[PDB]
Symmetry: D3
Subunit: 149 residues, 6 copies
Amino acid sequence: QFFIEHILQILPHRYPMLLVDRITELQANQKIVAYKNITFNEDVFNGHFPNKPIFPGVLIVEGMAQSGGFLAFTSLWGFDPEIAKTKIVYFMTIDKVKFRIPVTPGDRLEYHLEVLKHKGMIWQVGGTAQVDGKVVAEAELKAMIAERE
Amino acid sequence: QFFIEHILQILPHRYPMLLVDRITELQANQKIVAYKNITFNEDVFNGHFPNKPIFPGVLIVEGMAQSGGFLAFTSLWGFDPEIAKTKIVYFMTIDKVKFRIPVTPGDRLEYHLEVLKHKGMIWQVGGTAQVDGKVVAEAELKAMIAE
Amino acid sequence: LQSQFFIEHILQILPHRYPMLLVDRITELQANQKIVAYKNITFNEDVFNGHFPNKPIFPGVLIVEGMAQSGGFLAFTSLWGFDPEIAKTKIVYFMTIDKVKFRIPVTPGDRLEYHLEVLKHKGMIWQVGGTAQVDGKVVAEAELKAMIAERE
Amino acid sequence: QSQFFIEHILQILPHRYPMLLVDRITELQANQKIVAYKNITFNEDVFNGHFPNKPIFPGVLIVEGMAQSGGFLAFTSLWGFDPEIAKTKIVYFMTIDKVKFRIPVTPGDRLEYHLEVLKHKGMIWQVGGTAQVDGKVVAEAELKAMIAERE
Amino acid sequence: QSQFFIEHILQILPHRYPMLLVDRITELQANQKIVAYKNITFNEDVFNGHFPNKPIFPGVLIVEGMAQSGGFLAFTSLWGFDPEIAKTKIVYFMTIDKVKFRIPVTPGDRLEYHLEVLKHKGMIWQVGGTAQVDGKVVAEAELKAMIAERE
Amino acid sequence: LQSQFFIEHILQILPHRYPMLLVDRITELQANQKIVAYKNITFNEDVFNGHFPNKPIFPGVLIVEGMAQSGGFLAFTSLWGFDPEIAKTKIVYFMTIDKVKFRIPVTPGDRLEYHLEVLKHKGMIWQVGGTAQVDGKVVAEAELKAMIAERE
Ligand SMILES: [Cl-]
Ligand SMILES: [Cl-]
Ligand SMILES: [Cl-]
Ligand SMILES: [Cl-]
Ligand SMILES: [Cl-]
Ligand SMILES: [Cl-]
């Protein structure tokens, strides 16, 4: 399990684009289960939408991407902050995205990603986003890990 | 239950000071149980503290005051959005608060409040704030509803 | 229906608001066919504080979002024309997103131009596909299916 | 020293925007008392939600400002003015008692903190005092906070 | 009235967060002058980038506050405290001149705007004055605005 | 010293940060003489929340700020070329603003182009004057004097 502090040392993302609060499950080269809490106290809700708070679907995808990248990175180098700073995880494609249920404040947005296939630095992950056991979204993504600036 | 939509119709608090996401239990003139999710994606963490996100203890208290306010608006006027939209809430007193465990991103901050006393618009309640079944804080407070 | 709309008009049709209204101006609009709009990218946006420190890159998912909002404007006005009163009773919902591909990173100073075309539409169901471009170059491409839903 | 400005507060207190609620220190006696203040203006984010059409500086933030006042007094009383030592320290609230709000604080108010040390041992400080506007008391509070090395 | 609080300023000026830069009106003489102020606190977003580790209220925002004060003066002089009519007008500023900055403004400062009508002909208002902190002239500037119909 | 600089470069020269860095890219630069730069204007900027609701207008005073920052970039690079270690120790202070005229309101979707020339300069004191332009038209005019000083 990894907490926000650990996440912050692996991912370069910061406020307000770090969308993973905690990692509950992690199997190298296999899968990951992480989540992000959804609360009203988030700036996005001011505009999406007034008097009707709905967590953006694209951000649910961004959350799945971040989880997948965290998976791809730790599988290769484990918990290594120094190496994390020397790498970039670039998302090339995203496909098969489907939104079934709206995520709102109060929900625990859980990400479930598994490694579909990986060769070299190219990693393809897929899975779902869930709230209390039900699939609220699904998607497949492909990332490329490379050397930073 | 009362979801955020409902909460917004009763409490006048708005971003970034509305600190209750959902109401799980309510019993007029008795008690209320609600909660707020804590995530890194909240502006308060930029300054509290950099590299060490800790949900402010005073905001935990504010969240309990708000939970008690909801119970007060409802015990008073039931769920009546139009009477509510004309009021605001003022903090009167806060006492006997203790912080046991720090609340952080990933935590589900559950509020437990019971009414200790009340007269007219002045309400006194007390209880705790809990994370995964454990008490992270205790407090008592008195607020006033006003036109 | 005109073919050019400014932020004043976008605000009357779309429900999105700060910081999630990612379309600044509509330059071309063909009912039931296509729309060409754009969003200016500037460092002065909160998103860059966290994506990323010292290296501002506009989130690929937001590029898609801007594409969806552009398509939503096209879908709505393709049916009711510029009608604020009705627009305020409808909300465009996207059900799917496919074949998204990011080719070039978008950065402050860029003029992110959205190019969406109507692949299929029946009733309130709209399927759109297209690209996001900067200086005539494709920076991303996507396909999305949306639903014109009732706000209440 | 007895007077300190925002430059000095920033070097001592760990708090940062939008949670640094002390703008200036007008006087302080080591291990004894500190007088400081925070300017309240409409141009502050909390006002968007507290409350629309009626800007009222949150009561719990006045308490927060008093605590930070105490923290500054605590830190300088232990290590004097030492930024390098202070940069890795954090401050945890332990308890809050007998607080009472008497007058709403609004934009244009100069919120003045008055804290006195009621007891302190090691990293644990118990301060007590008031928040004043135009020489009048708007709030009272007693609180215990702990200075801790960040780990 | 002679003194207007944030509540009143909100009903007269269209400006909102984070561009409403006047917190209270302490003096107001129809067609002659106005004295108002805005508190300066660290808890303001602008200090995040102007400048990190050195909070200095932007000079262009001091002029803005001065302009806002001039506008209130002009509007109230024509129709008094009338929120209803206020919503149908705009105070378009055409020129700014002779502005000099003497002392930087920092968190903890009380920025007091001192403006006076230099000329009023038809829908054109010319105002000038200074920004002061604790009796000291911090900035001066002249501004010209046009009263028009809100669209 | 080149004549085209991007945000990553501007970030390494000017001390300004969000939400007060109002220059996104430099398109032209002549040491000690002139500079042409620009800032993209988008609805997705916090300042529009209050200036004004339902009618986004980029504040005129912020246009002068942008002109000053472009000037600042000119001054720094003229003085020390592209030098991040030395620039990092400085800040910029406004001294005077003059002859500012606001001819056309700037709104989301506009590309605010700054055109400044060095009127006078000696040491850390720089005096510049020029215009702010949108699609070839003069949107604003201004003259200003600024000083570069150690953050001490
Ligand atoms: Cl959505
Ligand atoms: Cl705390
Ligand atoms: Cl991205
Ligand atoms: Cl309060
Ligand atoms: Cl300045
Ligand atoms: Cl303006």
